[PDB]
Design a protein around this ligand. Sequence first.
Ligand SMILES: [Zn+2]
Ligand SMILES: [Zn+2]
Ligand SMILES: [Zn+2]
Ligand SMILES: [Zn+2]
Ligand SMILES: [Zn+2]
Ligand SMILES: [Zn+2]
Lengths: 343, 343
Amino acid sequence: DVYAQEKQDFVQHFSQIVRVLTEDEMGHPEIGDAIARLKEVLEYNAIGGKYNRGLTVVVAFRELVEPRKQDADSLQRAWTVGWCVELLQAFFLVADDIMDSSLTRRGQICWYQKPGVGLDAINDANLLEACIYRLLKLYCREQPYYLNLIELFLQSSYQTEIGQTLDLLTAPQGNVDLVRFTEKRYKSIVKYKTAFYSFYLPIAAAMYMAGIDGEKEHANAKKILLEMGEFFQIQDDYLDLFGDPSVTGKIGTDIQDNKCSWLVVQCLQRATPEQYQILKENYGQKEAEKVARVKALYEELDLPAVFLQYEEDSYSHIMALIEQYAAPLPPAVFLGLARKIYK
Amino acid sequence: DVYAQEKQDFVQHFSQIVRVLTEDEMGHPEIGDAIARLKEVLEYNAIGGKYNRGLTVVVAFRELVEPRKQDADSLQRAWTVGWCVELLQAFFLVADDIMDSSLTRRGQICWYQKPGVGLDAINDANLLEACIYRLLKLYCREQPYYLNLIELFLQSSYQTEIGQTLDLLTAPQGNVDLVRFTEKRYKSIVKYKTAFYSFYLPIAAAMYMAGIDGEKEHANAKKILLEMGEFFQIQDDYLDLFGDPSVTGKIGTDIQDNKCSWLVVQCLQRATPEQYQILKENYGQKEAEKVARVKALYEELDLPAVFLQYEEDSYSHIMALIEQYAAPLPPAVFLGLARKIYK
Ligand SMILES: [Zn+2]
Ligand SMILES: [Zn+2]
Ligand SMILES: [Zn+2]
Ligand SMILES: [Zn+2]
Ligand SMILES: [Zn+2]
Ligand SMILES: [Zn+2]
């Protein structure tokens, strides 16, 4: 709700982001074709999602900064940094869809699967990352928190990249071993690959702009946010197989890609040796029938039910964490976030 | 020479770089497998080249900073930033070899062509980039030039990425048009894709550590260095076809990849309509015979001779630029660099 009534402003502000990332180089006509390609990459890859992560920076900003400091300029910096978080996401998805061999994202074909794009998408992803820091400099160069944001974004990228490394190492193609698909291993992957940049990063950016730079305050916010992030990726795993493609906007690949998903960890925990053997011989393979075999085993073990029960318990667990760790921050900062991802 | 007698120190110092990038995370055992993979990526991709770019930061540092300020610690920061430039390079080569469909680099098979690696190499490249900023923070957090280096490296990456975008747009696969292969277009590509990070970036980093942050001094250094860079990429184009693979350490792909190389621009400038038609129908294709046809046309037009003449004239041109633009900087800063790449 407090997002929805602030979304439209955010989405519209994108045109100025795309304008300013393009006119910055008007005094360099020779790179015109590159700047055009960057436009195309932005319009295709920073748009069509829910913008939750960017809206969070903005929403949290209004809650953290005293109203008599929210000038038209502080507001503009807030949603630029918001779009910066969306660019980080755009950067990671473009590359992730190549490495996961995905087909669609946000209701359209993956950038790299577009005729004419292919593996040039790799440089496209890097430009999106670069755009972040061009904007931080254009809008926040002179702010007291400038360097804090730079380091926040860089650190968040390294963490996400460590996460992706765990995510790929644990899912070797053509290499089944269900034995590495454990609960500890799972929690490590999603903490790094999702939770830092999706939940800590947006709120922390807002915090730093609000002048809240205390190590102890960030640690507290972090305790809540990384746990939210853990649930959010479990939800992403569940929806990869059981979600509605018209809603999720994309086709799941976790079983074919041999991924350490929450679903496969839960399945391993409940399976008889007969069932385990069936998973062993059908997982991590590209054949429709073998994937359907795994899905059927999940439903036989009533994992969709198990998931629905974990969403209730997780939600209670996160609310408690908010009771313990929210202050001095307004609990609504975390509640509007929790509200957005639960049910 | 002033490099060679400083090389061995630089190369040995790499172990501490790899150690410090690995122990930073000892208090995070869960990412052990990721940190191991990062080790493997570093050892395979930051090693086996000539280290010219990194040595330049170091060499230029000794020339720019007063000796009674070169403590054991300032020296250590100097060659860390030197290795940071080498990591940027490692980052760009890994990704470039995928997008150029290259086979070998520095005498070995390309990282991404290694069994088991494949397109996971994309995340590997991003980790190498991340490593830069981990090191800048570990060693230069408290220096006055800290933020200047961060911005220098980020800006250099965006410029190189603009360069790569021009490089790829101009070479559409399956799309011959020799008409876009012009001299202006060529100069634009190599300026951005090579000259900024290979020549401006190392010297500028040294400058900033030496406290030389003046806009006018950097512009002057830049005038010399980007022109050196233009020649260096022309040399890279020449060697891609006519260089010795035991020396260059890699197989050329410019004709197959349909690239706007200096060789193809020179050929277009000298060719009769008969010759032009032969280029038109043999360029940009993967067939050995068709590539041999192009190479033969280059030799018929005596391009190797033309190149040798451009190396002489370029060298004179760069020396003049050094006479005009070097001061107040020691001319040796630029002379040791020029000496390293000419003949
Ligand atoms: Zn994915
Ligand atoms: Zn993935
Ligand atoms: Zn997923
Ligand atoms: Zn290449
Ligand atoms: Zn290339
Ligand atoms: Zn080349």
